[PDB]
Symmetry: D2
């Protein structure tokens, strides 16, 4: 039974229905390794390396998805190198191509580039879910753009705002995180071909000293992998600073989400909101997931700081554990946020009452600045105006309404629209 052994709670519970569970699986990674060896073979052939035949390539393409795990496992045992084992395994499936698989390339060629492909694919799915989450929150905000409630500083009544303005305040936190992850996705650079230390000496020799062919190969493989950007300067691997940026972008989602979810939990305790005695359990799961993403950046940064010269392998086990975990955690977090925003509702009776218990004083503070219970005379020059505000709280909310609408129409939608359907 699967329950008899420790299991990833993210994979088996919080993200069981996410495509990330497939994207980040060993099978998909090994598949990407083969796909990369395929593209490498195709590009080298296209560039004149005759030793790579079309028959060899056809075997590779035909057997890309065929995995003999029992065999692969024994191979990873005889020789303690996964890449070598998989190359050997792929070699036995494609005997004609066996000799040219990974020709001139380093193991890091498939390892690093497969991670980048797996990561970006995962990020693309996260971005679609992210957009939906933000869209749901925008819907909630518009729906409540004119529902008055008390603004709070130190968690205490400070003025009057609208549920919608606050909804947009939360929306902005999430939108800025979205924009960060969105920009990271556009700027992500592919490693391409760089050799074992980054000099490309093996490929150069392979091309009899022609550097333009080495550059063309690097560009060609990058193009096949569907990347617009690639590193030109590297050691054995692409800069781990790129991974820090990846983790940080997701940590922004965590910080933003935790602020939003804690607000909802507090507001629910105040009796103002109700997430889909009713406990805000979804919001609490949201804070737990968010807390994890928030505490991840410093490890990624330390990984970079710990990289020795052209490369030290103290990053492998660390990257293998860290990155897939944050990607999945972010997805589980977004799924939760989506549930919350789809059914989040306002306890209008409680909100109206909270507003009524505070509006007299906010009115008094208002009269004092402009300078019922104000028949002195002394408020004679501001009595009617204040009374009007008290009978129409919405006029006590400054520009909450227009701010809410313009932000959504001119900033939020234009930003996420391209990710929604």
């Amino acid at each position: 039974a699967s329950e008899d052994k420790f299991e990833s709670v993210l994979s088996t519970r919080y993200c069981k229905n996410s495509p990330l569970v497939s994207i980040l699986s060993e099978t998909n990674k090994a598949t990407l390794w083969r796909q990369l060896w395929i593209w490498l073979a195709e590009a080298e052939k296209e560039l004149g390396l005759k030793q790579v035949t079309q028959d060899a390539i056809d075997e590779m393409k035909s057997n890309r998805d065929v995995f003999d795990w029992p065999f692969i496992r024994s191979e990873e045992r005889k020789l303690k190198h996964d890449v070598m084992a998989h190359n050997h395994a792929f070699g036995k499936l494609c005997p004609t191509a066996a000799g040219i698989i990974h020709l001139g390339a380093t193991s890091c060629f498939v390892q690093d580039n497969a991670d980048l492909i797996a990561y970006r694919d995962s990020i693309d799915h996260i971005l679609k879910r992210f957009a939906t989450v933000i869209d749901r929150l925008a819907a909630f905000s518009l729906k409540n753009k004119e529902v008055v409630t008390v603004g709070r500083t130190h968690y205490q009544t400070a003025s009057l705002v609208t549920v919608g303005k606050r909804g947009v305040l939360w929306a902005q936190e999430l939108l800025m995180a979205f924009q960060s992850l969105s920009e990271f996705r556009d700027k992500m650079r592919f490693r391409g071909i760089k050799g074992a230390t980054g000099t490309q000496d093996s490929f150069l020799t392979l091309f009899a000293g022609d550097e333009s062919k080495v550059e063309a190969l690097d560009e060609l493989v990058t193009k096949k992998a569907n990347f617009s950007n690639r590193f030109l300067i590297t050691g054995q691997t692409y800069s781990r600073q790129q991974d820090s940026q990846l983790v940080f972008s997701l940590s922004l989602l965590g910080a933003a989400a935790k602020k939003v979810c804690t607000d909802i939990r507090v507001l629910q305790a105040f009796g103002e909101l109700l997430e889909p005695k009713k406990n805000p359990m979804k919001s609490e799961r949201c804070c737990a997931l968010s807390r994890k993403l928030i505490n991840a950046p410093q490890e990624a940064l330390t990984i970079l700081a710990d990289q020795g010269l052209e490369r030290t392998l103290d990053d492998s086990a660390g990257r293998r554990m860290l990155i897939p975990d944050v990607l999945l955690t972010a997805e589980a977090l977004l799924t939760t946020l989506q549930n919350i925003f789809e059914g989040l509702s306002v306890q209008t009776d409680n909100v109206k009452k909270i507003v009524e218990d505070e509006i007299a004083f906010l009115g008094l503070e208002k009269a004092m600045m402009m300078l019922q219970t104000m028949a002195d005379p002394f408020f004679d020059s501001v009595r009617d105006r204040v009374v009007g505000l008290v009978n129409n709280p919405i006029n006590f909310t400054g520009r909450c309404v227009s701010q809410t609408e313009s932000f959504i129409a001119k900033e939020l939608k234009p930003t996420i629209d391209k990710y929604l359907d």
Copy 2:
């Protein structure tokens, strides 16, 4: 295929042969929940609560290890509460005991206490492995207690030490971490019975207001669970400050191990040591695992800081992901350290040469303080003494030898001996 879905690399790779994979499994946790309900039932009966019959208890004890996962899963679906689902499931297996299962107790009774039992058991196994690791390092140190090499500050020659003194320097870092985890294990407090908010009101009513019976029950269950200490004051759960201490103790192992492994990696690069071109891959895996434990404390501390009043559930998902991960990471780290120390060896030819290229100058520095190539006269009062040191480097190492032996005999062994066999 298991490879087709994301898997915990710790569970499936770095710790596949560890009993922690069984101890931290869902099956073991659910089993502990049942064991706790059993002990609760036994204690309540022993204390006079007649509603708990021996037949009910016998059903429970007989069916403790019988799991109908397909049923349990559907139950966790109809009702979104694992504990309730498992209670229901255990109830169907024991129809006579169904009505008294968890009588007066809260879900946290099994949840919190099962974690504590699972954690301590895991810690006990970690401590046995830890002791073996330290023992191996002590063996290495004794073997090299008189093998001279250069001491280094800023990674550069500063004097002469012995490989063994350095081995004991590393041993102390690990021993202090061991002592921290060892003390934490002895001081760990059980939650026992506390009710949903920590007042024990349900048990009090159950005992018709007799507080001594409530206290006796709390003590009795703690005794059955094999804990010498228990909290008296709590909210719904036992203080998450205890979990911070747990994570911190393991972070000490990480800091210590990373310092040791980085030293070995650097020494191997210098050509002085060789872990079992030879790359220090095991030491690198050690730094990656260590880095993870080092970056965990702040999350545990934040979990405590985030706990609201008697309890907020923003800690569950967080604890479920954090603690089992650090426990497993520590075990994988210790397994690696053990491999390293069992076959770590000294490249005596290289060490001897490094010592020879530096000993002339260390000798010169020595003569200068006491005040061949010193025939001036000027060194006439210290020439023979220095020459003697250069022909016998070991006499240039101060008290390295006695320090190494006394530390091992009087501090290291007495501390770990009780955990070795």
Copy 3:
């Protein structure tokens, strides 16, 4: 003007009246360096090193507190080594002792040991303030041991507790932090004399090879410095793992305090408490200070992990910035907590009302378990009992009262009493 240049906000604002500002000053550190050179001189003389005369020692003791900063500054310039500069400066003040100052010792002798003395002294003051803080909270708890209020899970009504039980829940968090810092203080180990790499070779030669004299000197200096424990095994410095423990203990205070202060801020927002519209500004400052201590442990752990072989100086600037900051932050935090607990009060009218709006339902839940508005019949066997609970909420709080008293009398007081007056 001092305002014209960046200033430490801790030193100039949050701790301006604390003795830590004097204890952690450069003058006190240099003074400790001189005191250490004095003790070293005395011990070496007591052990037979005739070159150290009583006249030399008298100069040193007489001029220990005389600082010519302008001169010292120019000296720290000509030669880029503070210790050497101060030795030179102290040498000019004591021309007879100039030649034997720091005889056989390394710079780290004064640096590391002065830090330990400064740190422990700072910790002792922190412990006295800590005890007072806990004492104030215990006073508050006893005063409210029978003031009923609602218990909360997910920040929502879950039962009835007493303000005092909650006060003791907070008290325990702080007490466990206190015990950690208190134990660290008792176990703190002195570096003593160890040489530049930890072998004590210089002192050995100084004593003509007699190791017992080296050990006696190490013990003697430790005794003069008033330390019961000292390291026997070290590299150039004492293990930075000790500093991690120091920072972690203070991080426990931060986690505990933040949980307590956040609870108070939330309770004040609920209208249940009032710290000395009233905003909980002191509690907010408490969370900010606490947050800083919580985010410090991982840096200290990384410092240890980064230590290369016998020593790398990448820890100096880091330690100089980190440790004094956490010590001061903890003191500022404790001062704030003290203010809060001395005037914290309960809004009894609001609490009574909150209890009344919830007690009917808690009563209903109570009747359901035991099995006005219960005249069915159906509650006929529990109507009077529940009605009694509703007319006497205190009987609805389980063992809150006895738990509060026994914890304070048997755990809290015995622990802090020795630090209060």
Copy 4:
């Protein structure tokens, strides 16, 4: 004496000559507060608020830099609010303007906006120093673009590279950090006018309900403060997510710098480089400073996550301590890096020898791939080619040379050139 009290080691030692010490001083902050009140007054007047006279504004502009600290201090005492105290103080200096100072604005108006101005100014200076640092490293790299040395993986010989390629590898890490901080600087958004809760209700009333005037005022003040971007949506303060981005950008500098400095420290230990027995003390200070920036991001992220609703003040003390510290630490780090790169040199004799001891084997590995000591026959088809590589190591470095030049000319210079002179 200043030495008699704890001092900021950054302000008094590591950055004593930096303009950040002036920019981040209390005097400069209070000056910015006054400047902001001045701009607010000017804009409100320009927009029709007649109550603001030109005489009032002239007093303010004339007395902007006049500080009566003794008075200000007593004022900060009578009333426990710095902003109110400074307003009062500025009011006494400008009796005609006293009544309209900060008209309609919140304290956060000067607090938040002054921080943003102080921060950006500090960042601008950091960017100029950063550019110089990168320029120095590029100079070093070009100078050594053809100096061959061994490439290293696991800190061990893996191939041949050029000192310059490695220099450019380091340069890229720093350049990516530079680009991050550079982009953050361009995107930084001003808070502008938003009211106490973000609704701008006070300004709206002040403009008799005309929203365009409120928007114009917000835009006008932003323009006067010299900001191209401003937030439209906020609570009381501008999003603390912006501060997380600020801290993270600087943490990138720390991660990059630590990787670079650790490499230099290791290379110096190998005898390949020498920073300006020679210990790499500057590089060690660099790692200590870098470590601090690396461990800062998570606190900034937690600050955001902890922000309650429109605002909670648990961020003030935290921000006041965190941000100025990282800004100064980054400046001290850059100053150190600059020193290092200006005099960093290669120990050409040692490098040449290290290359010679390894080039035979690298040659053997090379021959094996293409398929003296190779006279078999068996190498007959590759003997001359390999021999040529061994007599000309530079041809063994793949594309190191062209990569180094193109990166510097096409990526590094175009990026930093605008910041150098």
